[PDB]
DNA sequence: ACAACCTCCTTAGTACATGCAACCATTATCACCGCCAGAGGTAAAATAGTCAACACGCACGGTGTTAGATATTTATCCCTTGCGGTGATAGATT
């Protein structure tokens, strides 16, 4: 209850058309349960930082592989999104259309 | 005591029919990297084998000659033309 607002200010970032303007807040409100259970204030650190790690990634996963058509081990989910993040160079440095042939040097790896 | 009635309140339930043409994108979001699985790698030997050696041995294809077929040439024959003589049709009657 004391943290229900911090769940909005983190979650609402990700609700940006992502799947809906709403639902990620309520999944953050369940990530907050694991956070409240493992709240090691006995290290010294603050619940702001706790939320910035754990509750943020509960908010991320709430529509990463949850609510999709498809779901995989998570390294192989967000790696598809590493490529979309890298494409921000491609679309302006090769800079007319995207080319997997450029992505091969930007990943140092074979396409297949 | 209730009853519906005066007024504009808002709510929200629908919006006819047949057909053809077009192509299928946008998001970001640390997945972290730690562990170890059976599990990737590969050495040495099972399930068994390569292809080079020297033999083996054969088929196929091209060069040569032969064969006979075919398309020409020739000339014959028939079926056809066009006109003509005169046909019994068309059909009205018996």
Short mmCIF file of C-alpha atoms (C1' of nucleotides) in Angstrom, two decimals:
data_model
loop_
_atom_site.label_atom_id
_atom_site.label_comp_id
_atom_site.label_asym_id
_atom_site.label_seq_id
_atom_site.Cartn_x
_atom_site.Cartn_y
_atom_site.Cartn_z
CA UNK A 1 0.00 0.00 0.00
CA UNK A 2 2.84 2.45 0.94
CA UNK A 3 4.43 1.92 -2.57
CA UNK A 4 1.31 1.78 -4.91
CA UNK A 5 2.31 5.19 -6.49
CA UNK A 6 5.97 4.23 -7.30
CA UNK A 7 4.43 1.23 -9.17
CA UNK A 8 2.55 3.72 -11.45
CA UNK A 9 5.54 6.05 -12.15
CA UNK A 10 7.75 3.07 -13.21
CA UNK A 11 4.99 1.00 -14.94
CA UNK A 12 3.40 3.88 -16.89
CA UNK A 13 6.75 4.36 -18.79
CA UNK A 14 6.29 0.82 -20.24
CA UNK A 15 2.45 1.19 -20.75
CA UNK A 16 3.23 3.56 -23.74
CA UNK A 17 0.98 1.63 -26.26
CA UNK A 18 3.23 -1.47 -25.38
CA UNK A 19 0.07 -3.63 -25.15
CA UNK A 20 -2.41 -1.46 -23.11
CA UNK A 21 -2.17 1.86 -21.13
CA UNK A 22 -3.22 -0.03 -17.90
CA UNK A 23 -2.34 -3.68 -17.24
CA UNK A 24 1.44 -3.46 -16.55
CA UNK A 25 0.71 -1.37 -13.35
CA UNK A 26 -1.30 -4.28 -11.88
CA UNK A 27 1.47 -6.81 -12.73
CA UNK A 28 3.97 -4.42 -11.03
CA UNK A 29 1.59 -4.56 -8.00
CA UNK A 30 2.36 -8.38 -7.94
CA UNK A 31 6.15 -7.99 -8.57
CA UNK A 32 5.95 -5.72 -5.48
CA UNK A 33 4.97 -8.89 -3.46
CA UNK A 34 8.40 -10.61 -4.08
CA UNK A 35 10.06 -7.24 -3.35
CA UNK A 36 8.14 -6.78 -0.03
CA UNK A 37 8.97 -10.42 0.91
CA UNK A 38 12.82 -10.07 0.20
CA UNK A 39 13.16 -6.38 1.40
CA UNK A 40 16.75 -6.57 2.79
CA UNK A 41 16.81 -3.03 4.38
CA UNK A 42 19.50 -4.86 6.51
CA UNK A 43 22.03 -4.19 3.66
CA UNK A 44 21.33 -0.41 4.04
CA UNK A 45 19.80 0.46 0.61
CA UNK A 46 16.35 1.97 -0.20
CA UNK A 47 13.00 0.69 -1.63
CA UNK A 48 13.29 3.20 -4.55
CA UNK A 49 16.37 1.22 -5.77
CA UNK A 50 14.61 -2.10 -4.98
CA UNK A 51 11.72 -1.04 -7.30
CA UNK A 52 14.16 0.26 -10.00
CA UNK A 53 15.59 -3.31 -10.24
CA UNK A 54 13.02 -6.05 -9.38
CA UNK A 55 9.64 -4.30 -9.81
CA UNK A 56 10.80 -2.71 -13.11
CA UNK A 57 11.63 -6.17 -14.55
CA UNK A 58 8.31 -7.62 -13.27
CA UNK A 59 6.74 -4.68 -15.24
CA UNK A 60 8.98 -5.57 -18.29
CA UNK A 61 8.12 -9.32 -18.25
CA UNK A 62 4.36 -8.52 -17.83
CA UNK A 63 4.20 -8.12 -21.68
CA UNK A 64 7.66 -9.49 -22.78
CA UNK A 65 6.52 -13.19 -22.94
CA UNK A 66 3.30 -12.90 -20.85
CA UNK A 67 0.18 -12.00 -22.98
CA UNK A 68 2.05 -12.80 -26.31
CA UNK A 69 1.26 -15.51 -28.90
CA UNK A 70 4.77 -16.94 -28.25
CA UNK A 71 7.20 -17.42 -25.30
CA UNK A 72 10.85 -18.61 -25.08
CA UNK A 73 13.70 -18.62 -22.45
CA UNK A 74 14.08 -14.87 -21.82
CA UNK A 75 17.62 -14.23 -23.22
CA UNK A 76 16.08 -15.41 -26.57
CA UNK A 77 13.07 -13.01 -26.11
CA UNK A 78 14.93 -9.75 -25.37
CA UNK A 79 17.80 -10.58 -27.85
CA UNK A 80 15.17 -9.98 -30.63
CA UNK A 81 14.87 -6.52 -28.99
CA UNK A 82 18.71 -6.05 -28.80
CA UNK A 83 18.52 -6.19 -32.65
CA UNK A 84 15.68 -3.57 -32.77
CA UNK A 85 17.74 -1.40 -30.29
CA UNK A 86 20.88 -1.74 -32.57
CA UNK A 87 18.75 -0.88 -35.70
CA UNK A 88 18.79 2.80 -34.45
CA UNK A 89 22.31 3.06 -35.96
CA UNK A 90 21.54 1.03 -39.14
CA UNK A 91 18.58 3.23 -40.24
CA UNK A 92 20.89 6.35 -40.28
CA UNK A 93 24.53 5.10 -40.75
CA UNK A 94 23.82 2.80 -43.76
CA UNK A 95 20.92 5.13 -43.55
CA UNK A 96 18.31 4.52 -46.33
CA UNK A 97 16.96 0.99 -45.60
CA UNK A 98 18.09 -1.71 -43.04
CA UNK A 99 20.51 -4.52 -44.16
CA UNK A 100 21.27 -7.76 -42.12
CA UNK A 101 24.72 -7.61 -43.85
CA UNK A 102 25.52 -4.49 -41.71
CA UNK A 103 24.03 -6.14 -38.56
CA UNK A 104 26.64 -8.95 -39.02
CA UNK A 105 29.52 -6.44 -38.32
CA UNK A 106 27.43 -4.70 -35.56
CA UNK A 107 27.07 -8.17 -33.87
CA UNK A 108 30.46 -9.71 -35.00
CA UNK A 109 28.48 -12.94 -35.82
CA UNK A 110 27.14 -15.01 -38.80
CA UNK A 111 23.49 -14.29 -39.80
CA UNK A 112 22.28 -17.95 -39.54
"C1'" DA B 1 -49.88 7.52 1.13
"C1'" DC B 2 -49.24 7.12 -3.22
"C1'" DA B 3 -49.94 8.32 -8.21
"C1'" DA B 4 -48.44 10.07 -12.75
"C1'" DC B 5 -47.82 14.23 -14.51
"C1'" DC B 6 -45.17 19.01 -16.01
"C1'" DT B 7 -40.52 19.93 -17.76
"C1'" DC B 8 -36.09 19.33 -20.39
"C1'" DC B 9 -32.16 15.20 -17.70
"C1'" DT B 10 -29.10 11.50 -20.04
"C1'" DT B 11 -28.91 7.25 -21.60
"C1'" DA B 12 -28.24 4.30 -25.91
"C1'" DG B 13 -30.43 1.14 -29.51
"C1'" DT B 14 -30.29 0.69 -34.50
"C1'" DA B 15 -28.43 2.65 -39.50
"C1'" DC B 16 -30.37 -1.93 -46.77
"C1'" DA B 17 -27.61 -4.79 -50.93
"C1'" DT B 18 -24.24 -7.36 -54.58
"C1'" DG B 19 -19.09 -7.10 -56.21
"C1'" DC B 20 -13.78 -6.03 -57.43
"C1'" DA B 21 -9.08 -4.16 -56.37
"C1'" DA B 22 -4.38 -4.32 -52.39
"C1'" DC B 23 0.36 -4.34 -49.82
"C1'" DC B 24 1.14 -6.41 -44.65
"C1'" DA B 25 4.69 -2.38 -40.97
"C1'" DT B 26 5.04 -0.30 -35.33
"C1'" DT B 27 7.40 -0.95 -29.88
"C1'" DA B 28 11.82 -1.65 -26.50
"C1'" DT B 29 12.58 -3.91 -22.46
"C1'" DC B 30 19.81 -3.85 -18.89
"C1'" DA B 31 18.34 -10.71 -19.31
"C1'" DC B 32 21.87 -9.25 -17.40
"C1'" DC B 33 25.63 -14.04 -16.22
"C1'" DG B 34 26.14 -17.35 -13.01
"C1'" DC B 35 25.98 -22.52 -12.87
"C1'" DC B 36 26.28 -27.16 -15.04
"C1'" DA B 37 23.99 -30.20 -17.77
"C1'" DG B 38 24.23 -34.92 -19.85
"C1'" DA B 39 26.36 -32.53 -23.50
"C1'" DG B 40 29.53 -30.59 -26.80
"C1'" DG B 41 33.86 -31.89 -28.58
"C1'" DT B 42 37.17 -35.46 -30.35
"C1'" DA B 43 40.30 -39.09 -29.53
"C1'" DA B 44 40.70 -43.94 -30.25
"C1'" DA B 45 37.57 -48.69 -32.19
"C1'" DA B 46 33.13 -50.07 -33.00
"C1'" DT B 47 29.57 -50.41 -37.55
"C1'" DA B 48 32.56 -52.13 -40.82
"C1'" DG B 49 34.47 -48.33 -45.31
"C1'" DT B 50 36.85 -45.60 -48.29
"C1'" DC B 51 39.06 -45.17 -53.17
"C1'" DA B 52 43.59 -45.73 -54.85
"C1'" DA B 53 46.40 -49.28 -56.63
"C1'" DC B 54 46.75 -52.78 -60.35
"C1'" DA B 55 44.37 -55.26 -62.37
"C1'" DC B 56 40.07 -56.51 -64.51
"C1'" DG B 57 36.44 -56.35 -68.25
"C1'" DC B 58 32.90 -54.22 -70.77
"C1'" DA B 59 29.78 -50.73 -73.16
"C1'" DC B 60 29.21 -47.32 -75.95
"C1'" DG B 61 29.78 -44.33 -79.61
"C1'" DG B 62 31.92 -42.72 -83.83
"C1'" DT B 63 33.88 -43.73 -87.88
"C1'" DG B 64 33.25 -46.35 -91.71
"C1'" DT B 65 30.41 -49.08 -95.11
"C1'" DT B 66 26.35 -50.70 -96.39
"C1'" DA B 67 21.33 -50.70 -97.02
"C1'" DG B 68 16.88 -49.04 -98.61
"C1'" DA B 69 13.95 -45.65 -98.46
"C1'" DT B 70 12.07 -41.66 -100.04
"C1'" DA B 71 11.24 -37.63 -102.89
"C1'" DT B 72 11.97 -36.55 -106.79
"C1'" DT B 73 11.22 -37.04 -111.68
"C1'" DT B 74 8.36 -38.93 -115.26
"C1'" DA B 75 3.75 -40.38 -117.25
"C1'" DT B 76 -0.18 -42.42 -116.98
"C1'" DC B 77 -5.20 -42.57 -115.43
"C1'" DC B 78 -9.78 -41.06 -113.64
"C1'" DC B 79 -12.87 -37.93 -111.79
"C1'" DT B 80 -14.25 -33.80 -112.48
"C1'" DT B 81 -15.68 -29.52 -114.85
"C1'" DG B 82 -18.77 -26.69 -117.43
"C1'" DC B 83 -22.27 -26.41 -120.82
"C1'" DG B 84 -26.24 -28.23 -122.91
"C1'" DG B 85 -30.54 -30.87 -124.07
"C1'" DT B 86 -34.52 -31.53 -122.38
"C1'" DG B 87 -35.71 -33.83 -118.13
"C1'" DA B 88 -41.63 -35.89 -114.53
"C1'" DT B 89 -40.14 -32.28 -111.17
"C1'" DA B 90 -43.35 -28.95 -107.99
"C1'" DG B 91 -47.62 -29.65 -106.67
"C1'" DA B 92 -52.61 -29.10 -108.61
"C1'" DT B 93 -55.57 -31.94 -109.63
"C1'" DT B 94 -57.93 -36.53 -110.30
#
